[PDB]
Amino acid sequence: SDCRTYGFNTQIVHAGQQPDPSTGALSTPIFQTSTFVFDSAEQGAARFALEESGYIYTRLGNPTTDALEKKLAVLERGEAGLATASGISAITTTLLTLCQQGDHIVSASAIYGCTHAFLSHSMPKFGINVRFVDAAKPEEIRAAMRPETKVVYIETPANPTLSLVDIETVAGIAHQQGALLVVDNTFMSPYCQQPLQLGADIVVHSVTKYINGHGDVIGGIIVGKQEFIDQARFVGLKDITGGCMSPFNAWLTLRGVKTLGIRMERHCENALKIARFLEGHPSITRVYYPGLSSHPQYELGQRQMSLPGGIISFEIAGGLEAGRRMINSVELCLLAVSLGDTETLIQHPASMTHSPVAPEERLKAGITDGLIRLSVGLEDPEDIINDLEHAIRKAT
Template structure:
């Protein structure tokens, strides 16, 4: 199944695996081993020298993990991929790979709380500076680039404000300046958006979310458009920092990928239904959803995303008190961080996922105390709307 002409839904199920090489097993085997035996001392030497393919040690590579990596590379239209023990392991690995002391990272003005924390660590300990900037126009992007900028790090849609960044515009400017572009594609998944196709150099995922889809794995994925870059990262930062994924977690992600397209269609359809309901509710002050026709970035979202996705953020009247009261009144929807699960989840970014971000920066990102983020699950949308309606009626 190595033909790149196959449609993406077929690749999600088959890419990177042949049962002929694994005693006919239809399911990808789980190679739950830490190390691999060599037939001879000379074979071990050849493998360590890179002269022969084959297992050495699971921190350096594992057959189950390799299937996941090859499948993810195909899904994101890249030449190579790496799997990690968490999304943050993927984020930290690519930033360490791309930077050195004295360099500058330019980021979208909204960013995941732990990525924000990592950037502060890099600045405080290693003098790798960063700026969070409005990157919505060519003029603003050019103005934010510094002589020592080596990386532009993008979230789109941005977590949790759902702001859209024009990936093609960013990459066009970055190429002119010789800057690498990294896109966190967690909110969209490869089914809805492919940043490498739009010019990015690397795309990453918290695979905990839509890639897995079942709320039972912590994992990360990094895909590169250049195989040599990925191989270099594999043999240096990933190997020596050690943020690898376990074979069992990789096996669970492979299982999750088989239904990604089916799940994403349902997530997106449910979210569209809930958006329509929330938009007409008088207790909802603001709503943030990529495919809102009133969104000034709607045309950009349509250009680079297949659908609006499964996430909606909104504010309610009454600020933080009513936001928390609404969450507490919900009966079906669960109060939990994360996203992309079968269950619908709601969380309060300013006191949960982004609580590490100081208030001044949170406000600049657009994260107010009344903002709620809803990850729409796979339930019947009528049940979800009924739950939201009864909770909203009590605030």
């Protein structure tokens, strides 16, 4: 019995999971319990000093959460996993585990906004400095390293613009200089990109997105070597963020992840079609999509990703006002944040998430007035395309 051995689809379905030993129940039971019962005083002391296995209390670990963690470790080719309340909590639990006052981080600039603020306004208040670079240009990463640099942090593709970061090249710079690479692998799952295999040390995910895939879990997951994971758990989560995952949330995300392979295939085949349509459209000025040949890092993309992903950005003819009109005129696509659910979602960070954010903040930070982000769900592409077509046509 070793699940690391089977093909990747078999692993998505089976790894971390086994029928319940005392009943045969095939679905992983929801161990919705806060506490666990020891059968002896000495056994309670054994477990508590970390001297024996296994369970003590849900903040510390849980058999439902354990399966999910073993699964994701397997899919990412990591040694171990640690689930968390949110993807944000996967990132902060990681970096607050790795960092004390006086340390330095080097970060991609082109990351998720809530990650940006943690690093911008919160990290330095604990005396941990962060320097921001265009991670697409790995020399910038080298140029910002310092003796106190403990961690280099990246997302690929980069949330807003779908630019890429060469992981292997970034792995070697960070390592040469004594730092760990931490890669947020959220936009791809491990079905699409495996940063650990490229030399990264830690992978984090918002399991909220594709891994759960169903738009009803907020959660995160950390994957890395056993020694780091143990600290992330017994200190970072146990003591610092306390962002542990509900066993219900674990069990939903195990449910969600069974269909990861086939949902990724369909997300990505759908998005390719939609992107090609967007490219040919006279009212669309630019399309950002790793699967379009016109993508500046297309070849990089072809080597480190099995699939170009379910996310498309694009700019519409006429900026802010046209984008507003278009986003108000979709009938199928839903106006919401988050991504990686089975429904097609659309966001206009210009008329929307960044509207009373002064025009000059915006542009510096990769966002245009016409920029629309699409999360492509599992609908028939024709239906999405016709909805897009209608609303674009409406708006220009």
